[PDB]
């Protein structure tokens, strides 16, 4: 996260850390959607151009964390994965279309002041809140600049209209993506960056006070560049696939 700040304790209790077993390192963010299911970006698990291809046994998830690196004894929960589910039409070759994956924990996690699931949006909530100029919030332990933090970072960013997103990049945008970020002379800055993928872009409903995950950190070109925007997987548009995997498996 570029130009963000340190998260408060328990500010993002659905934030999950995807951690590699060997070598021991942070891979990506992720989000807690139920006591057994964690959502992330597909590219965090499968990206053949970088020779990335993880199995359920290569990974742990770390739930409840604040510190990037230190083991937060009796606060965080480290869970092994039962199974990973990558969208069958995840398009890693072209533009990361449908950059989405589900991870089923072996055992359910107990909720706490530090661990609590985020809501997934329905049609009513997405129509209402996912509008250009409204702001959401992104969180992660990824880089502080294009190349980092001691603790989880947060930044709030405005949703950008589809035309501007489309014009800001030569990558082909799809309806399974949105972009967010300040325009070049808008008065503020900020962005997700490498290492923040799979983290949630959330919005607070002013009608029922709940947080909804509208996006997944998916991709950008550099970080916090003028005239460029962060791209996010559009969770609502992929919600049928989410529901099918959870209902089946």
């Amino acid at each position: 996260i570029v130009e963000g700040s340190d998260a408060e304790i328990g500010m993002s209790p659905w934030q999950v850390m995807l951690f590699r077993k060997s070598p021991q390192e942070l891979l990506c963010g992720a989000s807690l959607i139920s006591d057994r299911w964690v959502l992330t970006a597909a590219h965090c698990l499968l990206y053949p151009p970088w020779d990335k291809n993880f199995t359920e046994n290569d990974l742990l998830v770390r739930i409840g964390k604040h510190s990037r690196t230190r083991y937060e004894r009796n606060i965080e929960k480290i869970s092994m994965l039962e199974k990973i589910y990558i969208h069958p039409r995840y398009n890693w070759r072209e533009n990361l279309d449908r950059d989405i994956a589900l991870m089923k924990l072996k055992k359910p996690v107990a909720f706490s002041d530090y661990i609590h699931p985020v809501c997934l949006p329905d049609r009513e909530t997405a129509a209402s809140l996912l509008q250009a100029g409204y702001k959401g919030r992104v969180t992660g332990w990824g880089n502080l600049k294009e190349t980092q933090p001691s603790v989880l970072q947060v930044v709030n960013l405005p949703i950008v209209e589809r035309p501007v997103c489309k014009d800001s990049t030569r990558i082909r945008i799809t309806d399974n993506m949105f972009c967010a970020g300040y325009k070049p002379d808008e008065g503020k800055r900020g962005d997700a960056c490498e290492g923040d993928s799979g983290g949630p872009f959330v919005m607070k409903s002013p009608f029922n006070n709940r947080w909804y995950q509208m996006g997944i950190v998916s991709w950008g070109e550099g970080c916090d560049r003028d005239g460029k925007y962060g791209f996010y997987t559009h969770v609502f548009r992929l919600k049928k696939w989410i529901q099918k995997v959870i209902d089946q498996f």
Partner: peptide, 28 residues
Amino acid sequence: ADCGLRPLFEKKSLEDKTERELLESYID
């Protein structure tokens, strides 16, 4: 069920330090 409500914030009627920015984007 009680998704999206934070024990240390919503549940305690406490605001985090920047959430007001979010709510303002909806109404100025």
